[PDB]
Amino acid sequence: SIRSLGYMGFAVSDVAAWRSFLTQKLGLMEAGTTDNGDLFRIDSRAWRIAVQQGEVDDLAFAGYEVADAAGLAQMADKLKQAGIAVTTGDASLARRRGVTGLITFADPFGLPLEIYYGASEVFEKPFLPGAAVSGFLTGEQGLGHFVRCVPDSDKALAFYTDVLGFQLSDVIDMKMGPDVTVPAYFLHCNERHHTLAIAAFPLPKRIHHFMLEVASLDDVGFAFDRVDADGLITSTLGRHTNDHMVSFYASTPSGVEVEYGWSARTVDRSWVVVRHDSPSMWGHKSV
Amino acid sequence: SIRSLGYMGFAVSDVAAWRSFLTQKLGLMEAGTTDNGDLFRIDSRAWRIAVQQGEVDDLAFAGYEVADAAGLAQMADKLKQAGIAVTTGDASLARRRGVTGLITFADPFGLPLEIYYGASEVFEKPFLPGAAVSGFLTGEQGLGHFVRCVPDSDKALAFYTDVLGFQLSDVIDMKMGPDVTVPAYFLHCNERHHTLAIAAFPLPKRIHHFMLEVASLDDVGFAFDRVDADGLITSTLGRHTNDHMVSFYASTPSGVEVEYGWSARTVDRSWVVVRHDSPSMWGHKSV
Amino acid sequence: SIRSLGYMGFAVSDVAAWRSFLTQKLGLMEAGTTDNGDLFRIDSRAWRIAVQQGEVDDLAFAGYEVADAAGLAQMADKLKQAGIAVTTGDASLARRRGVTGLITFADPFGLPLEIYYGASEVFEKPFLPGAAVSGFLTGEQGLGHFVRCVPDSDKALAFYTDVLGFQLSDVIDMKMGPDVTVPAYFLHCNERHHTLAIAAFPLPKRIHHFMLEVASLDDVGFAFDRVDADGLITSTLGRHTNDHMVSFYASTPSGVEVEYGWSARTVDRSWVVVRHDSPSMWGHKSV
Amino acid sequence: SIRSLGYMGFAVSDVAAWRSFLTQKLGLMEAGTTDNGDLFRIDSRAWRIAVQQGEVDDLAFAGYEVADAAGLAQMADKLKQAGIAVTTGDASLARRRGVTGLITFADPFGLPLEIYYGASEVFEKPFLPGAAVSGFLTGEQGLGHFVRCVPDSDKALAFYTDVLGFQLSDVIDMKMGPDVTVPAYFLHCNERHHTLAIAAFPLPKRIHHFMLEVASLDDVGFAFDRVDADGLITSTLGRHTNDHMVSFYASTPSGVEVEYGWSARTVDRSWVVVRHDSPSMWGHKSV
Amino acid sequence: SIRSLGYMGFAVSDVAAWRSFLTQKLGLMEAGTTDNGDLFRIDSRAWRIAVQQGEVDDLAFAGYEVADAAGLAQMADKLKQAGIAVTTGDASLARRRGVTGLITFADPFGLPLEIYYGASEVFEKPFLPGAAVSGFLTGEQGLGHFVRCVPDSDKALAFYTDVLGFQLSDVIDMKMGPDVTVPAYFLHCNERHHTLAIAAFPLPKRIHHFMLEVASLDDVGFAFDRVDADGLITSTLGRHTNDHMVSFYASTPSGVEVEYGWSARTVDRSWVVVRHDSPSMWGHKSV
Amino acid sequence: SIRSLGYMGFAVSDVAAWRSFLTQKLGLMEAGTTDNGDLFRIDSRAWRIAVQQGEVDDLAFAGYEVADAAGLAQMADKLKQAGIAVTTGDASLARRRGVTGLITFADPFGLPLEIYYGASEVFEKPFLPGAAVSGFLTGEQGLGHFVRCVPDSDKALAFYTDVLGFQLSDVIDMKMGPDVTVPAYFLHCNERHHTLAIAAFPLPKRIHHFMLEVASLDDVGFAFDRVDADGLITSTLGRHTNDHMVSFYASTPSGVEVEYGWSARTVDRSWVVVRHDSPSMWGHKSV
Ligand SMILES: Oc1cccc(-c2ccccc2Cl)c1O
Ligand SMILES: Oc1cccc(-c2ccccc2Cl)c1O
Ligand SMILES: Oc1cccc(-c2ccccc2Cl)c1O
Ligand SMILES: Oc1cccc(-c2ccccc2Cl)c1O
Ligand SMILES: Oc1cccc(-c2ccccc2Cl)c1O
Ligand SMILES: Oc1cccc(-c2ccccc2Cl)c1O
Ligand SMILES: Oc1cccc(-c2ccccc2Cl)c1O
Ligand SMILES: Oc1cccc(-c2ccccc2Cl)c1O
Ligand SMILES: Oc1cccc(-c2ccccc2Cl)c1O
Ligand SMILES: Oc1cccc(-c2ccccc2Cl)c1O
Ligand SMILES: Oc1cccc(-c2ccccc2Cl)c1O
Ligand SMILES: Oc1cccc(-c2ccccc2Cl)c1O
Ligand SMILES: [Fe+2]
Numbered sequence A, B, C, D, E, F: 001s002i003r004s005l006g007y008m009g010f011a012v013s014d015v016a017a018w019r020s021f022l023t024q025k026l027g028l029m030e031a032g033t034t035d036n037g038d039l040f041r042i043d044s045r046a047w048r049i050a051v052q053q054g055e056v057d058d059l060a061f062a063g064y065e066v067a068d069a070a071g072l073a074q075m076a077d078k079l080k081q082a083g084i085a086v087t088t089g090d091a092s093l094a095r096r097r098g099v100t101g102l103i104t105f106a107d108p109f110g111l112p113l114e115i116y117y118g119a120s121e122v123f124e125k126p127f128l129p130g131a132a133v134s135g136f137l138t139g140e141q142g143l144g145h146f147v148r149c150v151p152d153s154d155k156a157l158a159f160y161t162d163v164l165g166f167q168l169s170d171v172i173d174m175k176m177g178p179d180v181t182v183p184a185y186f187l188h189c190n191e192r193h194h195t196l197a198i199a200a201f202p203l204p205k206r207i208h209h210f211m212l213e214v215a216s217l218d219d220v221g222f223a224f225d226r227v228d229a230d231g232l233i234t235s236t237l238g239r240h241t242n243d244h245m246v247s248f249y250a251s252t253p254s255g256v257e258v259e260y261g262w263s264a265r266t267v268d269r270s271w272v273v274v275r276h277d278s279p280s281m282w283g284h285k286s287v
C-alpha cells in the first residue's frame, strides 16, 4: 500500500524565481542540479521537490512511496486490474529520481503519477535550511500534501480511494458564492490528516496548493514575514477546522499557492468521517 | 460497526423549561433552533441533544455513529438480515440531523433509532458552556449513555448485542424490594464502560436516565448545587461499583432523570464480564 | 480462552488455624462464611480463597476465569472434543461460587477444576487487609499461581497446554540430588510469568505451594517476620531466576506451602522459551 | 519465525589471544570452558560467543533463536521444502550448546548455521564484564549482527529472505573504487536495524565483522582506547547512515574485524526500504 | 563545613584476607598499592578505603571532606578555638592521601581524624567492581557511614556536633538486655541520613561497623550469598526504622563488621528529630 | 557579580580565512560588519565573536557580562579598591559593542578585558548557522570558555578569583614531560563547569584555545569531518575528566586553537574542588 507522498516535480517558466522563493522564503535546502532539474530538500532525503524549466508553471508529477519491491508490485497489479495503463520506470528514470524501482501512470485527469520504493537518503550531507527554520515535519507522514483540482470530484475520489487506496478523513463544503458550494475531500494514507485533497475549484492548474509543515510556530511566523515583504501572502495566519493546522498561504512564482503550517493533529484507525461548513476555525482571511 | 452514541432527541411538553435546565443547570450550549428543534452542544459537534415540542416527555430518538459510508451499509445489511425494517434517511432528514447519510429503524420495543455517518463539526463556533463547566468528555467515547427500560431484558439484550453489536461489560442485580431483584445489563461499543444499559424497571418512559460526563470533580460539585437549589436532586453524590463514575442524579422537566458524572474507568479488549449486587460503592443515597 | 486463575478452595483439618494464618500472617481479609466455606479476599472480588473442613489438608479445587459466556462455551467444547468428562455447574454451585456460569471437570491426575465467567465484585465492601499489607497484585494477572505435583509431567504438560491453552514460559531443571534432576515447567495464560507450574516432586499433596503477590517489598518483609515468629519459614528471602520475583516460602497448617512475593517481571508475545539450572538468583535458602 | 541471532562460534589459531582480546579489550565475561570451547558472555545467557582451536581463523557457526519447539519445527519444514539438507541436532550437540532443541544446516555458501530454542540462562551467575563496560544491549534484539561475505549477493539475499525470513531494512552501494561499487544489504528479524548484512567483498573470510552494542558512549570511548593502545583500530569513531550507530572497528586476532557501538535506532512495521551511497554520516575514517 | 566522609584507613593483621573480602565479597575495585597501603575504590575517586598492615585490626583513621581551601581553614580555626591540637598535614602525607591539603587531629577518644580538600579523581581509569555490583552510591553523600563506639556518648556527641558541625537525625534506644538500654545517635553532614553514628557499645574496637551503599536490591542479594558461603553473615536482610535502608551485616577479617545496603531515604532542612525503640522495621535477625 | 563570558574579539592577519573557518567549518552565523569588525553569532545576541584586522593573530579582548548597571558599578568599585586602572567605556565604545554600559581594564598580564551590561538581542533576525549545526549552548552559561596562558598562574588565579570573583572548580596537573608538570586551574562564574582556565603553557599567545558548545553529538561529529578535510584537527574526539565534555580541538587561522564540544556536566553550590592527573577520560589523542 502507498505509505506517503514522497516527492513532487514542478515545471516552471522562471526557475531562478522558484530557487529564490523555496530557499530564501520557505527555507528549503538547495541540493544540486541534475537531469532531474534543480533539487531541493527539507530533510534527510536526497530531494523532495524538483524544479524544471517548463512553460506550464504547474505540478509536473508527484511520487507516492511504497514500503518495498513487493508493495510496488502489488500496486502495479491493482492499477492494471483497474484498467490503468502502467509503465515500468526504466533504469534512466529510476536513476533520475534516485529510487530503486518505480512505475508510472496518470490519474483520471492527466496528472502524471509515480509510485516508487527505495529512495535515496543523504544523512552524510546534513540538512541545512536556506532560511531560519527549526525543521520540517516529515518522517512517516511524508512530504506534506497537495490539493488536486478536478472537473469531477466523484470520479477523482473513486480513483484515489478505490484504486490507490487513500482513505477519507473528512469533507468540507466550501462556500464559493451565494449559489455555489463545492465539496472538498481530504484523504489520508498514513497518520497525516491528509496527504491529498480533491475539489472542483475554478483554477487553471492541476493543484491549488502544496503544503509543507514545520516544527515550530516561530518557523511559520518568520516565514510569513519573509513572504509578506514581497507582497506574496494570499491568506493571513489561521487554523483549519479539520486538521487543526496553523498556517498561512502564499503565491509561488507560478501562481499556484503554497501553504506553510504547524501543529496539525493526526488520524488513527479510530478516526470517524465528519463534515464541515468552513475550512478555518479562525484567521485565514483572504488578502 | 457502531462506534458511539452520537446524539439524542427529546420530545417535551415544556421546551422553555428544558432550555433553562440544560443550559443554566447542566451547562450545555444553546446552538440555535432549526427544523430539528432547539439544539444543544457539549463539544465541537453542531449538536448532541435536540429538544422538540411534544406531549410524550421522553426520549424521541437516538442516533448511533458509524465510521463511514461502508460502515453504514454493513449495519444496514445486518439489520435487514435480522428481519428488521430499515429505511434510508431521505435528504430532508439527513439535512435536519446535519449528517451525510443515515438509516432509521426501531428497537424491539418501539424506540426510534438511527445509525449515521459524517456528522457536522463546528470548530469555527467554539464551545462555550451555559454554566461554569470546564468541559465535557466525549471524543471516541461519544455523548455518554442512557438506560433503556424494557419489559423483557433478555429480548432487548439479544437485539442490542446480536444485531447492533454492543458488548457486555457487566451485570448488576438491582434490589428493588425484598422479593424483587432485576438484572441491569451494561453494554459498551467503545472505551466508555457503557454507552447503553438495559433493565426491566417499572417506569412509564423509554429510559430511566441519560448521562453526561464532565472533566472535573468541581464541574459535578457546582452542578449539584445549581440543581439542588431548585430541589431537583434525586440521588446524592456517589461512585458506581462498575464504571467507578462519581456522579449524582436529578430530575429533568420530563420526569426522566439525568446523571452528571466524572472520572469513570474505561474498558479494553482485556476486560472480563463480572456481576455486582449493588450499583454504588458509596453515596448515591435516594433523596 | 482462559484469562487467569480466579479462585482456589482448600479442604483442611484445622479451619481455625487456616483462618488465623491467612488473616494475621498473610494479611487476607475475612469475607464471611457461606456454604462455600470460610471466604477470604485479597482484592475487590467477593472471595479468592475458600477454606472448608476436610481431612485431606490440600487444594480441593481451582477455578480458571474466562471473559464471558461465549468463552466458557468454547472451552467446554474443547474439553469435550479432547475426551474429557465435562459437567455444567448447576444453579446451586454457581450461587455457591458467586459466579454466573461454570463447568466442572478434573485434570489427568484427579484435581477438580472449574472454568467460570461472571464472578462477583464487592467494591461496596472495600478491601481491608487482616495485617499490614499495602495491597495485593491481581487485576488482569489473576490470583497468583500454584505448582501442581504430578507423577508424569509430560502428560500433565500436554493437558494444560493442548487442552486448556496454557503457554510455556520456561523450564527449570531442579536438582533434587546427585542422581536426581526433575524438570519444572512454568506456564502462563496472561501477563503473569506463570499462573501454573508443573513438576514431578515427591510430595503427598496435589500442590507444593500457591503464591500471592504483594505491592511492596515491605509487605513481604513484614510478613516474613510475622511468619518467622511462629517458626513457619521454609525458605529465606530470595529472587527467582525466571520470573524475578522476590519472595519467601512458609508452611500453611496443611503442610502445603505458600509463597509470598513482590516485583516479578511479566511476559509478552515477544517472550522466548528458555531453560535454567537453578530456581533462585540469590537467597531462598532452605531453613 | 527466527527471533534473533543468539550465538556465534569462532575457530581460531590463537585461543589465548582471543581470550585476552574479548575480555580485556571488549569487556566480555569469561564463562568457563566446555566441549563447546572457551565460552564468553555479555548478558544473562550462559554464553554468546564460543572460541575453539582451529586453523581457519573465522566464524565457525552461528545460531539463530526461535521462540519455542513449534517455531523450530516450522523453520525445519520451510528449509526442507526449500530443498535444504536439514539435520536434527543430537542430544550431544544440544547439551554442548546448552539448548533444548536445534537443527543444523548450511547457507548457500557453506556457513554452518543452527536454529535453536530454549537456550540456558544463568541469572544466578551475575554478569561481570572483563573490562569497564556499563552493559551490553541484547534482550529482544539478540547478540548483535555480522556481515556475511559472499560471491553472489543476489543468491544469498534470496536464501536469507525467502527461506530464513529475514526482512530488508536498506541498501548501501559501497564505493570500493572508481569502477567498483558493491551493494550491501542490511536485514532485520526483530527491532535491531540489522542482525545480518550481505555483501560481495573481496575478503578471504566468511564475515567481514561481527558487532556488539553497548549501553553508553563512554563504553565505546574507553574500549576504543584499550584497542588503540595495541594498534588494532581499523576505523575511527563514526556514526552510520542507516542504523545511526556510533561505533569504531578493530582487528581481532583472526583478521576478521569487530564493530563496537552505541545508540543505534531501531525499526518497526512502519519502516520503508531506502538506499544510501555512503555507510557513514561522519567519522569511520580508515586508519 | 564538612561535606562528607571521604575515606577510611584500616590497619589489619591479615592484609590478604581483607583484599579478598573487599573485592570478591563486597565488589570493591583493587586500585594499586602505595605508601598509603593497598587501595580500594567504589567510584571515580582514586581510593576510598586503604588497608595497611597492623596488629590493631580496626579503623586506623577517617577523612572528612570540605569543599575547598577556605573550608579547611575555617574548620582548622574552629578546632583550635575549641582547644583541639591540630596539625597541618605535610606534603608527604598529602601526597600519600592524594589530596591537595589536609589537617590532622584526634577525636575525644583517640580516633585519628583528618579533614581535607581537593582529593584525586581518576575518571580515566573507569571503575570496574571486583564482583557483580551495578554500582555504589556516593556522590554528594560521600562514602557511607560508620558507627563510633565510645565510653561516653554525651561527650562524643558534643564534639561531633558542636566542634565538627554534624547534625542530629534521630536517636534509637538500643535494648541490650532487660536492664540495659543504650542510646545510639545518628548524625548527618549532607543528604545521607547518617554519615556517623555514636553509641556506647561493649566492643573492643573504635567502630562497630562501616557501611557501603549499592544501587540495586540485587547487588545486596548477591553479596549476601557470597558472604554467606563463607559463614560470615551476622544479620539477615532487614530494613532500618530510621534511614529505611535495606541491608545485611557481615564480619570482616578484623571482627569489625560491614553493613551492605540499598534504598535508604535522605534528609533535608525540613527534617525533624525523632526517637525509636527498635533499629529494624523487619529482618536483621542476629545469626 | 560577573554572570558569564559574553563576547570575544580577535585581531587576525587573515580576516577572510577566519570568516570561512567560523562559518563553513564551525557553523557560526555571519552577522554583518561594523566598526567593531566582522561580527559572528551563535545565538540570539547581535554578536558573540568579532574579527578585526591585526597582525597579532590572537585574542584582542574579552567581555564579561553583569546583570545590570548596579552590578557594573559594584565590579568597578572592586577593581579600583584592588588598585586596578579602570576606565569607563565612552559612548562610542558602548555603541561599537552594542552594550548599554561598560568599563575597561587589563588583567595582570596585559589581556584587555571589559565588563558590561545590557547587550543587544536580535530575535527579529533569527539565528541561521553557517553550517549544519542543530544549535549552540549558551543561555545562562554564556558563550563558552577560553584558556588563559600566563607566566605565573598563582598571580593570575589570585586576580581572577579575589578581584573578578571567579570560583575554582578543579585542578588538573598537566604532564608536559618527564620533568615538567603544570597545574591548570578551571574556574566558574555560573553553571558552566568552567568559563575560564588558567595555565602556564609555553605558547606565544594569550590563550591556548576558546571553546564553543553545541547541542548534539552529531553537531560535533559533522564539524570534526569538515575541519579534518582541511587537515586542521589537533586532537581526536575525546571526553574530559573534569567537565565531561565530549569534544575535539582544531587550529584556527591564527594558530590559536578552538575546542568544539557537547554534553558537559554543570556545577552547583554543592560542588567540591578536586584534582586530576589527566585531562581526558578517553580520546583526545594528539594528531
Ligand atoms: O491562487 C491560485 C491558485 C492556483 C492557481 C492560480 C492561477 C495561476 C495562473 C493563472 C491564473 C490562476 Cl487563477 C492561482 O491564482
Ligand atoms: O489543508 C487544508 C485544510 C482545510 C482546508 C483547506 C483549504 C482552504 C481553502 C481552499 C482550499 C483548501 Cl483545500 C486546506 O488547504
Ligand atoms: O425518576 C424517574 C425516571 C424515569 C421516569 C419517571 C417518571 C416520569 C413521569 C411519570 C412517572 C414517572 Cl415514575 C421518573 O420519576
Ligand atoms: O451509570 C450507572 C452505573 C451503575 C448503575 C447505574 C444505575 C443506578 C440506579 C438505577 C439504574 C442504574 Cl442503570 C448507573 O446509572
Ligand atoms: O513442604 C511441603 C510441601 C507440600 C507438602 C508437604 C507435606 C504435607 C504433609 C505431609 C508430608 C509433606 Cl512432605 C510439605 O512438607
Ligand atoms: O515461583 C517460582 C519460580 C521459580 C521456581 C520456583 C520453585 C522453587 C522451589 C521448588 C519449586 C518451585 Cl516451582 C517457584 O515457586
Ligand atoms: O579487515 C579484514 C576483515 C576480514 C578479513 C580480513 C583478512 C583476514 C586474514 C587474511 C586477509 C584478510 Cl584481508 C581482514 O583484514
Ligand atoms: O553496521 C553497519 C552499518 C552500515 C555500514 C556498515 C559497513 C561499513 C563498512 C564496511 C562494511 C559494512 Cl557492512 C556497517 O557495518
Ligand atoms: O561484631 C563485632 C563488631 C565489632 C568488634 C567485634 C570484635 C572484634 C574482635 C574481638 C572481639 C569483638 Cl567483640 C565484633 O565481633
Ligand atoms: O545504619 C543503621 C541504622 C539504624 C541502626 C543501626 C544499628 C543496628 C544494630 C547495631 C548498631 C547500629 Cl548503629 C544501623 O547500623
Ligand atoms: O596549538 C597552539 C595553541 C596556541 C598557540 C599556538 C601557536 C601560534 C602561533 C605560533 C606558534 C604557536 Cl605554538 C599553537 O600552535
Ligand atoms: O575544557 C578542558 C577541560 C579539561 C582540560 C582541557 C585542556 C586539555 C589540553 C590542554 C589544555 C587544556 Cl585547558 C580543556 O580544554
Ligand atoms: Fe492545505
Ligand SMILES: [Fe+2]
Residues within 6 Å of the ligand: A167, A188, A268, A269, A271
Ligand atoms: Fe484510516
Ligand SMILES: [Fe+2]
Residues within 6 Å of the ligand: B145, B147, B209, B211, B259
Ligand atoms: Fe448511569
Ligand SMILES: [Fe+2]
Residues within 6 Å of the ligand: B167, B188, B268, B269, B271
Ligand atoms: Fe469489548
Ligand SMILES: [Fe+2]
Residues within 6 Å of the ligand: C145, C147, C209, C211, C259
Ligand atoms: Fe512459586
Ligand SMILES: [Fe+2]
Residues within 6 Å of the ligand: C167, C188, C268, C269, C271
Ligand atoms: Fe504467550
Ligand SMILES: [Fe+2]
Residues within 6 Å of the ligand: D145, D147, D209, D211, D259
Ligand atoms: Fe556493522
Ligand SMILES: [Fe+2]
Residues within 6 Å of the ligand: D167, D188, D268, D269, D271
Ligand atoms: Fe519488518
Ligand SMILES: [Fe+2]
Residues within 6 Å of the ligand: E145, E147, E209, E211, E259
Ligand atoms: Fe549502619
Ligand SMILES: [Fe+2]
Residues within 6 Å of the ligand: E167, E188, E268, E269, E271
Ligand atoms: Fe540538617
Ligand SMILES: [Fe+2]
Residues within 6 Å of the ligand: F145, F147, F209, F211, F259
Ligand atoms: Fe577547553
Ligand SMILES: [Fe+2]
Residues within 6 Å of the ligand: F167, F188, F268, F269, F271
Ligand atoms: Fe561555586
